[PDB]
Amino acid sequence: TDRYSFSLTTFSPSGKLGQIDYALTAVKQGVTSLGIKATNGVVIATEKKSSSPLAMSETLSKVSLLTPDIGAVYSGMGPDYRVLVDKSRKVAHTSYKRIYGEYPPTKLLVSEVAKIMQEATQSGGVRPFGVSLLIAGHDEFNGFSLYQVDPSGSYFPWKATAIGKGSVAAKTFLEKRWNDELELEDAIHIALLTLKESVEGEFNGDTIELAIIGDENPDLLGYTGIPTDKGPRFRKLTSQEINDRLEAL
Amino acid sequence: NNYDGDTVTFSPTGRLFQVEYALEAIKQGSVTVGLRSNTHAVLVALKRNADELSSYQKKIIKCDEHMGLSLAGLAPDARVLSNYLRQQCNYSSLVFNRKLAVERAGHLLCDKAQKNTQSYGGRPYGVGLLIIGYDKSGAHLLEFQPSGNVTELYGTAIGARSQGAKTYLERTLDTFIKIDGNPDELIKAGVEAISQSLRDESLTVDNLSIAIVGKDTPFTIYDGEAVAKYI
Amino acid sequence: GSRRYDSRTTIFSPEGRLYQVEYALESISHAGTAIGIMASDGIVLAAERKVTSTLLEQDTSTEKLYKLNDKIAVAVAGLTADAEILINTARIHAQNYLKTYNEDIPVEILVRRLSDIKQGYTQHGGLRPFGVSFIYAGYDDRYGYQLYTSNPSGNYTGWKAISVGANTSAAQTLLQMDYKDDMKVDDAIELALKTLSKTTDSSALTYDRLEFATIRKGANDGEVYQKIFKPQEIKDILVKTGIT
Amino acid sequence: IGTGYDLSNSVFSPDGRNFQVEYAVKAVENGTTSIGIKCNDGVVFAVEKLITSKLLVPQKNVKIQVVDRHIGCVYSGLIPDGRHLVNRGREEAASFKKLYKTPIPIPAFADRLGQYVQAHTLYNSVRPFGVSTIFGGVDKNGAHLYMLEPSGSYWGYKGAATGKGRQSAKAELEKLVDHHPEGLSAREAVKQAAKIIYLAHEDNKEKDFELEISWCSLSETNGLHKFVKGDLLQEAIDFAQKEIN
Amino acid sequence: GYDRHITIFSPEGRLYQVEYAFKATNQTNINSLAVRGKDCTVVISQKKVPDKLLDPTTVSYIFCISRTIGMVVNGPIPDARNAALRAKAEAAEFRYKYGYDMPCDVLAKRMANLSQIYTQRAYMRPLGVILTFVSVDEELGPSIYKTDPAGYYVGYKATATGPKQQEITTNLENHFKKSKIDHINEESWEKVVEFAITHMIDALGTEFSKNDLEVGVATKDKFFTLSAENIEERLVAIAEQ
Amino acid sequence: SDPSSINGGIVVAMTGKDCVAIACDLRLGSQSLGVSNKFEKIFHYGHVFLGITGLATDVTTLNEMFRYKTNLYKLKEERAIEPETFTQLVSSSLYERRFGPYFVGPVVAGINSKSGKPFIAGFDLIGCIDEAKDFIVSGTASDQLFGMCESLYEPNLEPEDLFETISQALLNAADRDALSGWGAVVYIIKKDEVVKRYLKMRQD
Amino acid sequence: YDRALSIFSPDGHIFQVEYALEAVKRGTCAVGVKGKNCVVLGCERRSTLKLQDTRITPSKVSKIDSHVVLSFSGLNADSRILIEKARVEAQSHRLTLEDPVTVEYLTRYVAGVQQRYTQSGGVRPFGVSTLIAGFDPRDDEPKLYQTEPSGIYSSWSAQTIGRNSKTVREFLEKNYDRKEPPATVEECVKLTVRSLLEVVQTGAKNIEITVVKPDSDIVALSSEEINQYVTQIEQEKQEQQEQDKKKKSNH
Amino acid sequence: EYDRGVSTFSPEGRLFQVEYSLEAIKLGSTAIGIATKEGVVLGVEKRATSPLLESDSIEKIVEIDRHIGCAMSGLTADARSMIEHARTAAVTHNLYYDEDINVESLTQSVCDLALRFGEGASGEERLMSRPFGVALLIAGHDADDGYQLFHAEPSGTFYRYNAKAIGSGSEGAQAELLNEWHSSLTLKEAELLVLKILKQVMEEKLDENNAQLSCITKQDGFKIYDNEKTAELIKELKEKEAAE
């Protein structure tokens, strides 16, 4: 069985933990992903890639819904993203939703996912997660809000940011295109456009996944007749929709 | 290299080296010779003291009123097994009204030794026991290896310089089985046998320890003035 | 085997010294400055962030000032991830003491408790230590203001003015030179920005790399109010002391 | 690159092979030879049991132990470790018989022991098995026969062998299904189980041996695992002596 | 120092150990080819019998998991029986607690997590097997989900596995590039098996016998494997092609 | 006897337009004997007001329980908790000890800072959220309270109409009940300003 | 975690004990001298570190009982953990077996805390050496003991542990009589101050003096007391020098 | 050789850690023991390291119970854990059968505790991580065999000795014993016989502030002798060697 009860994340002699740095290496191999926080939405975009063209990417989720207000997008390992999306869903409901009756604020859920990162540097027999997530979301008290969770286990709030293999180019392009006021239609127009200087394969709506956490929908709620509840502010855009807006760049 | 300090790792020559090293624990122990017939089994043990003022180390351990074990390995390791044999002897009597069979008692023994040779931090027991006993199948002599392998024998020996005793018994094999109803002689043929393992160690009233089991005798250990009529 | 692969983080060296403890303090010098100055009317806590960017939001980042309880705040130096685990343990430990004795936790008690958890990992279990060092700004009725630094080893020693994190040597000596016991919070603010101006690892002492907070006795009704300043009030006070 | 790949067994060497588990096969080679003929009627096991000296007692020691009441399990390699794999399935079968109230199928049993021997190759805290077992019997799905490598791999078989004389045994069973294309009863098959052990004692012609033969057959013992003994056995021995002369 | 012997990250950000699992899924040397029909899903595999003594019936690599979901395994047969066992246990467990039969989508995710967890603890060896799960869903149509030793999975139009799989993948690629549809069109399932065998005869450069094949088909609500007698019948229909 | 009538206690709560008011008595008895005429049953975490009736000791236990939970809410998310969010936490804490529960009956009363709506809610022993926009009454003179409160009350009241109604409602049940009365405190909770007004009333 | 981190060595030691003894050397020195009616435990407080508020700071001497005090040298993070277990056992003794602890029980207990950790895995021994002194209750004889990282204890009539231990102890051997201790409490303080001013020197900030008397009197002397006594020893020292100087000329 | 485990071997084939423990017996200070038919004398060098030392708080003779004594040499903190069990065992037996425990049965029970090293093995709990490094001379008197004196090893094996020494000067001590021991010693000649051997293997002066005697006689149970009586006895050794 088990017979490991000692960490394999250890400090180096000149300081700095060796393992949390290596794990951050595996992230910059992966795909390029971005998130731009506007005044009325957050838009996130990522690029979809497959083993082969016989593999579908329409049955693979590189954007996930954690709660009806807070979505996720990654650059890094697919497998690590999978488990870390599920454990977040489970802790979102069990360590706040039952007790407080509503879904967690964006900040509050971010804070929780950061301790899971922490327990894979700390505790024996485990190695760190190898994804950096952007967790974009909306809560009633921080407005719209963008965070970047990393393998280190620390998070930083952003105004717009990039992670992946194109990260350095992306953020130099994003510096010049972030404006104080950004409308939701303008925000989509920067995010597709940034991702396009970080694509060298196919460019189609079936290879570019885009999701808005715009403003609310009373048409994906599944019911009507309670005016308290206003549906998902998260709304992933199908391939066709994204594709119209590629022809309008 | 590190195949030799890990009990969980093979060994490109197909061994484990730890059980082997553990088999060398028996060679540095003292000598004992067992021989059995169809009505009586005998253990004839050479005790061995450290210096002149030291006592002599008991080498026949009473396991029951009809079962006895004798060590020839290392003494501390033998104290874990002696209890274990006693425990399964009282459990067999208690539950099933059965004076625990000798042959089945070997099979229990195997699996206690095996499960620590499979497991890390564990070790094979360094002791190797010769186990006598009298059940309804008659008398038996078992040789228990540190391997956990048990074998059934007309007479054998283990310890230091054990090979010479095996020879005395390989010859005299067809004499003592046809001795039956005369424990006196059965005891006499093992005295001559352990005398071939000496090297000027002699046998006195403080060195010799014999224990027998019968169809008309329980378990008895002779020592002191009771082995002085069999020098 | 599993014995092979064990690091052994909880052994003494031949010198008598704990490898992981020496390294933990070493890595906290990569992390940003943190300063605390204890006045005789409050405590000023002022810290320079370990990272800044031009795309980063600089107005809700918290990686230096965190409230453990109502009347006790920390300044952070180490990795923030490490600090976040202990910060929710301290917040609990404080909140428990209030629960059972119906009085708010003394500063001495809460600080010895944090050091004991840290000590524990270097003492037993084979787990890395947390590389964090806190300066505690805190108030109690018992001795009034107390300033304290604890280290990853798990020992606390009182201070009048102290610095942990980046350029430790530079800040501490300068602090001794300007220290008087006649300072009040107005003065204590001014010296804390002035020492940071000398340790600054950038072009000038800019608002967007500062977190800044105080605990004041000039606050109303004869009771401590902890004020964690916004960056729009830091930008205001940065003109007041005349640096910019 | 690196150094090792033989210190632990939940490493994988780069080739795509294991170690330790790859080395454990050499351990089973040091054993004696043991055969199984799957007959139409049942199965007939036989095992070469070495007699080192005349110090040991003949026909009093066994490498054929019963599991359940209708399954022979007969093994080669390191004998205490092989007895631990037999011990394990006595536990397993008794639980199944409690739970589902039927004699445990041979195909069920084959899955069960397989998972356990696989299971020790997935941790570094325990040692890989260094024995191979050849087991089978008669249940109601017909006669079946299996060999289980210490690798955790098992297959169907209609003839098996393992140990030193696995080259001559494997080849002489090839001859045995090619003599008889419509198969043979278990009563005759006692006599071939003796012949090919004596031929696999020419790999051990520095030693002398006592032959144990056992059978589980539907209609010679009513589907129940027993030992072959007495007058029927002495006839199998005589056939085998003539065959090697 | 050690990092190619346990499951911690290397300087490069890669897990060499996880990389060896993909070079250990080819030791069987067996090729498989799996295609989606209109209402049927077909998987064909090679099956070899090394000796006389071995019986082919038992030699298998197509293991029935649910009662609708089969799983075709490339790579070593210990890691195949363990992977079959867990997957099977889960399939039952889902029925018990949510009261319908397991979606393939979810068993592919489910096993992906468990695969991952073995690369995420140091002691536990990950399983060197590529599992291809074939089904006909009742909500999600005909599907193929393929897991692999990382604990990744993705859906497929069609897929192939084994060592000689490069050749096979390209043949498959041409058929759907030419057609411009994501699945084979034909309602009778008998013929989707036929199409499949031809594409394997051309790709591997060989004709076949009934014993060299072992063919599994999932129709609606059931999984079966075809007997070897029936497989000869599939082989005659290639002379009618 | 009854585990929630062995020291008595009552809480009344009413809404008005743009205001709420809550009020409790100050009686702690041990059965027949009066021990104290100055034990509170209302507490305040932030600008939310939680009145707790029922067994003596569980009023106090439960006050320090929510004192613990309110601190951690405020610290993480950097605001005072809202009335509506809090009501859900009052429900869960009762339900966790589903068997052998806390033998209380709290009343949540606030005015939301994010919408400006009066909002009130109630609980039994096990705790079922009882919506209202009228008033919620709880305790051992609650049978009397439910009749008395309804009769005077006109849907919506001014901030100081509301002081005259909820004061009379509380007095008249409390002097027809034996385990209630004995000095009482009435609160008027406006937007940002709470006044605590003790009441002159019958001590006998 | 159960791995052996204490492994018998072929030198006939344990490397983790010898190394911890070394951990102790690096400490700041504590000196223990016992009178006939007092114990006096003084400790070195570093004077490198400056703007060190000491109103709130933990003393290098910690009272366990109202009459049994402990001081410590070596690692100062580890020291508080032993103090924590020792405080709890003292009040358990009062609870179940009655009566306040003896000096001898408390010492014997502390010896058992480090001893246990010496032969348990998954830990390493503490690197703290203790001087435990105080009076037994219903007696008025000074008791001064030292425990060491091994988990062994010995009583002494003066002792020193920590840095520069050899230089002090060498002094204490030659300025004390074990048959007749210092006559009074004052003489006993003046001898501990004289020892600290050897190795430690550097002002009078470093010197702390705790005096425990029988009948549960722990008093700790403030800076003004220390200073009176420091001045007398510096003058006396100067005066001697001068009278040696006259004698040399004379010869 | 191999010390990368505690249940590691050794092509020799013996416990390697146990082999290392026996050599930590020769760093103790000598304990001598003479068993006769009038009683058993246990004498010990206490050792004086300083004349600041209080030497009488250092004891190497300890009472287990009224008719059994023990002498330890080696690491006396290890002897704390083992002497503790002895005290508990002997008392347990006097509850459970209300009778004297055999010296043999007592000795034997203590061998079982030492063999409990390990990382986890056997049908029992290994609760140490390294073996004891202390040897015992369990003396005593039981009503079966009379006076008996046993040597309990850190191996876990016990031999009954007429006379044994353990310690630094063990080796040279035992040489004198082979010739000078006989069964016609009187009790008070045994006391002088201990101090004769103790003076020879002494690394200091022979005196009464670094030597202690103890007896077990039936007539007064186990009594550990006063320092005044030890002085008289040290000088009476000194009279009979000058009658030469």
Swiss-Prot record, chain B:
Subunit structure: The 26S proteasome consists of a 20S proteasome core and two 19S regulatory subunits. The 20S proteasome core is composed of 28 subunits that are arranged in four stacked rings, resulting in a barrel-shaped structure. The two end rings are each formed by seven alpha subunits, and the two central rings are each formed by seven beta subunits. The catalytic chamber with the active sites is on the inside of the barrel.
GO BP, one annotated term: proteasomal ubiquitin-independent protein catabolic process
Descriptive protein name: Proteasome subunit alpha type-6
Pfam families according to UniProt: Proteasome, Proteasome_A_N
InterPro entries per UniProt: Ntn_hydrolases_N, Proteasome_alpha, Proteasome_alpha-type, Proteasome_asu_N, Proteasome_sua/b
Family the UniProt entry places it in: Belongs to the peptidase T1A family.
Note: Present with 7210 molecules/cell in log phase SD medium.
Gene Ontology cellular-component terms listed: nucleus; proteasome complex; proteasome core complex, alpha-subunit complex; proteasome storage granule
Gene that encodes it: PRE5
Superkingdom, natural source: Eukaryota
Keywords from the UniProt entry: Cytoplasm, Isopeptide bond, Nucleus, Phosphoprotein, Proteasome, Ubl conjugation
PROSITE patterns with a match to the protein in the record: PROTEASOME_ALPHA_1, PROTEASOME_ALPHA_2
SMART domains: Proteasome_A_N
Coiled-coil intervals, chain numbering: none
PTM-bearing positions, type Phosphoserine: 11
Record carries keyword Iron-sulfur: no
Compartments (UniProt record): Cytoplasm; Nucleus
Glycyl lysine isopeptide (Lys-Gly) (interchain with G-Cter in ubiquitin) crosslink, residue number(s): 188
Swiss-Prot record, chain C:
Annotated keywords: Cytoplasm, Isopeptide bond, Nucleus, Proteasome, Ubl conjugation
Cell location: Cytoplasm; Nucleus
One Gene Ontology cellular component: nucleus
Cross-link Glycyl lysine isopeptide (Lys-Gly) (interchain with G-Cter in ubiquitin) mapped to chain: 99, 198, 230
Any one GO biological process: proteasome-mediated ubiquitin-dependent protein catabolic process
Top-level taxon of origin: Eukaryota
Function summary: The proteasome degrades poly-ubiquitinated proteins in the cytoplasm and in the nucleus. It is essential for the regulated turnover of proteins and for the removal of misfolded proteins. The proteasome is a multicatalytic proteinase complex that is characterized by its ability to cleave peptides with Arg, Phe, Tyr, Leu, and Glu adjacent to the leaving group at neutral or slightly basic pH. It has an ATP-dependent proteolytic activity.
Subunit and partners: The 26S proteasome consists of a 20S proteasome core and two 19S regulatory subunits. The 20S proteasome core is composed of 28 subunits that are arranged in four stacked rings, resulting in a barrel-shaped structure. The two end rings are each formed by seven alpha subunits, and the two central rings are each formed by seven beta subunits. The catalytic chamber with the active sites is on the inside of the barrel.
Family: Belongs to the peptidase T1A family.
PANTHER family for this protein: PROTEASOME SUBUNIT ALPHA/BETA (PTHR11599)
Cross-referenced NCBIfam families: PRK03996.1
Protein name: Proteasome subunit alpha type-3
Organism: Saccharomyces cerevisiae (strain ATCC 204508 / S288c) (Baker's yeast)
From Swiss-Prot, chain D:
Entry comment on modification after translation: The alpha and beta forms are probably products of the same gene with different post-translational modifications.
Stored PROSITE patterns: PROTEASOME_ALPHA_1 (PS00388), PROTEASOME_ALPHA_2 (PS51475)
Origin: domain of life: Eukaryota
GO annotation terms (biological process): proteasomal ubiquitin-independent protein catabolic process; proteasome-mediated ubiquitin-dependent protein catabolic process
Keyword Cytoplasm: yes
Subcellular location: Cytoplasm; Nucleus
Main location group: cytoplasm
Keyword terms of this UniProt record: Acetylation, Cytoplasm, Nucleus, Proteasome
InterPro entries to which the protein is assigned, alphabetical: Ntn_hydrolases_N (IPR029055), Proteasome_alpha (IPR050115), Proteasome_alpha-type (IPR023332), Proteasome_asu_N (IPR000426), Proteasome_sua/b (IPR001353)
Pfam families: Proteasome, Proteasome_A_N
Function: The proteasome degrades poly-ubiquitinated proteins in the cytoplasm and in the nucleus. It is essential for the regulated turnover of proteins and for the removal of misfolded proteins. The proteasome is a multicatalytic proteinase complex that is characterized by its ability to cleave peptides with Arg, Phe, Tyr, Leu, and Glu adjacent to the leaving group at neutral or slightly basic pH. It has an ATP-dependent proteolytic activity.
PANTHER family (alphabetical): PROTEASOME SUBUNIT ALPHA/BETA (PTHR11599)
Family per record: Belongs to the peptidase T1A family.
Note: Present with 12000 molecules/cell in log phase SD medium.
Protein name: Probable proteasome subunit alpha type-7
From Swiss-Prot, chain F:
Molecular function as annotated in GO: endopeptidase activator activity
Residues where Phosphoserine is found: 30
Pfam families: Proteasome
Single Gene Ontology BP annotation: proteasome-mediated ubiquitin-dependent protein catabolic process
Cellular localization per UniProt: Cytoplasm; Nucleus
PANTHER family: METALLOPROTEASE TLDD, PROTEASOME SUBUNIT BETA TYPE-3
Family in the record: Belongs to the peptidase T1B family.
Assembly behavior: The 26S proteasome consists of a 20S proteasome core and two 19S regulatory subunits. The 20S proteasome core is composed of 28 subunits that are arranged in four stacked rings, resulting in a barrel-shaped structure. The two end rings are each formed by seven alpha subunits, and the two central rings are each formed by seven beta subunits. The catalytic chamber with the active sites is on the inside of the barrel.
Protein name, UniProt field: Proteasome subunit beta type-3
